[PDB]
């Protein structure tokens, strides 16, 4: 948004880069931070942990009613069945979209997000535009920003992750997918569908 007081993006990046390199040099000298530690964290969240993991969970719940039951009772324990779990997902609670209820998740106080199944959140989730508005005008926000029209009669439940409970949406299974394989079903499951900002993909 226009701010006549604000430096250019290029000036801001240049200043942040120097500040970060300075702090990095100090933590390196303390013996607490190394180049291989930095590279490892970046590899894990670029390539090892991300929404493909949540998609496996969703499709299992869609094709396995007993697993779905376990997943809604205790999301952490259910996801461990698939070898999925860890940091910032130690206490997952999954919530089920139905014809009667639509769920959407937010961290109004910061950016908390179910990392083991979704990886790190996209920038818009961590920014104040989405965080401020979704608890107050969720139906308008879903329409205006995501093209997603939730009819007025359907309850929208917004889950604000103020504690270490991490809420994840189980989206409803798209029509037209009867008897599809777990691999085919996965092509329909997006991070947005597990945040609750979009439904799973039609078709």
């Amino acid at each position: 948004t226009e701010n006549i007081l604000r430096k250019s993006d290029e000036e801001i990046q240049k200043e942040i880069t120097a500040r970060v390199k300075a702090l990095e040099s100090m933590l390196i000298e303390q013996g607490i931070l190394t180049t291989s530690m930095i590279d490892r964290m970046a590899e894990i969240y670029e390539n090892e942990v991300g929404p493909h993991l949540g998609a496996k969970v969703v499709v299992k719940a869609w094709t396995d009613p007993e697993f779905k039951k376990r997943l809604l009772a205790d999301g952490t324990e259910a996801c461990k069945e698939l070898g999925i779990g860890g940091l910032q997902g130690e206490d997952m609670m999954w919530v089920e979209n139905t014809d009667e209820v639509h769920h959407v998740v937010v961290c109004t106080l910061c950016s908390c997000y179910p990392r083991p199944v979704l990886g790190l959140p996209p920038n818009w989730f961590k920014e104040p535009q989405y965080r401020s508005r979704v608890v107050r005008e969720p139906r308008q926000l879903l329409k205006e920003e995501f093209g997603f029209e939730v009819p007025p009669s359907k309850e929208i439940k917004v889950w604000d992750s103020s504690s270490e409970m991490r809420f994840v949406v189980l989206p409803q299974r798209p029509a037209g997918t009867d008897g599809w394989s777990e691999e085919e079903l996965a092509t329909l499951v997006t991070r947005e569908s597990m945040i609750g900002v979009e439904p799973a993909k039609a078709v």
Partner: protein, 226 residues
């Protein structure tokens, strides 16, 4: 604290900026900032609640428009000064040096297997906050409770939009680290934790969605029966 960062229900922040795609890390400095979290946490700069409190103490104008991982840098420097592990004068000198010599080398250092093991263990093992306590839960599903109007000046998880509002207990989760002690360096002091359902009418008055509810998590001291 009643910081600007507690943005739920704030109007006027403008439309969401959401590019059609984006990388996980937009620049190499963000990978550094991100990895500095396990590094400073292992080193005793801060726990998770204290990390959040450092960000909440930011200049709100800087908070609202800076790149997200810049918030992480502010909190590491906050806690580095608090604990006497970072000298601000040295940091300021080094900043100017890397402003003028952006491609200068980082300091010579040894790699450490124990840091790689620490990172893999955190990522895949987790850092669970649940704890056992002596007392049973005070509240239970179906209880109608009002959220406290206390306004601590240190860290807490008391969004202004829920304070003094009435909701219904949906679930008791067990006890967890309590932010009002932990984020202020006063230790874990674990408290039972509950999800509580507030209607959009209760939160927003007649401007609320008529068919919507917000679920917010409340530690035991945050709520009492109506």
């Amino acid at each position: 604290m009643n910081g600007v960062y507690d943005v739920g229900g704030t109007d006027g922040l403008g439309p969401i900026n959401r590019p059609a795609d984006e990388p996980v890390f937009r620049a190499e400095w963000e990978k550094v900032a991100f990895a500095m979290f396990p590094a400073t946490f292992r080193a005793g700069f801060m726990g998770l609640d204290e990390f959040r409190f450092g960000i909440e103490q930011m200049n709100p104008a800087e908070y609202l428009e800076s790149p997200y991982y810049w918030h992480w840098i502010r909190t590491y420097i906050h806690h580095g000064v608090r604990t006497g592990k970072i000298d601000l004068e040295e940091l300021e000198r080094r900043t100017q040096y890397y402003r003028e010599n952006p491609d200068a080398p980082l300091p010579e250092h040894e790699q450490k297997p124990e840091l790689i093991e620490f990172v893999n263990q955190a990522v895949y093992g987790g850092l669970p906050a649940s704890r056992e306590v002596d007392r049973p839960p005070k509240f239970k599903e179906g209880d109608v409770v009002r959220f406290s109007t206390a306004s601590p000046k240190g860290h807490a998880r008391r969004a202004r939009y829920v304070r003094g509002k009435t909701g219904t207990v949906v679930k008791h989760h067990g006890a967890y680290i309590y932010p009002d002690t932990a984020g202020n360096g006063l230790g874990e002091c674990p408290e039972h934790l509950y999800t509580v359902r507030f209607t959009a009418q209760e939160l927003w008055g007649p401007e609320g969605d008529p068919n919507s509810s917000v679920y917010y998590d409340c530690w035991e001291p945050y709520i009492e029966l109506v």
